[PDB]
Amino acid sequence: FVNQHLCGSDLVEALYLVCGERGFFYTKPT
Amino acid sequence: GLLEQCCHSICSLYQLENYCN
Known part of the structure; x- marks a missing residue:
């Protein structure tokens, strides 16, 4: 992407x- | 520093590709 x-x-x-x-690993929902 | 740079600023999928398993 860019900005x-x-x-x-x-x-x-x-x-x-x-x-x-690939099953990323971002954070969870707060 | 995961969504803070993307939420508190801008980021590139490049460094975001590191948050993948």
Whole structure:
């Protein structure tokens, strides 16, 4: 990507694509 | 420093690819 603020489940979204089936390890829901 | 740089600022999927297992 370029310049984008990722936050909340949006993080696993960025990971979803880079890894996705690789099961990322972002944080949890607070 | 996982979503703080993306929530409190901007980040690139590059360093974000490190949060994957």
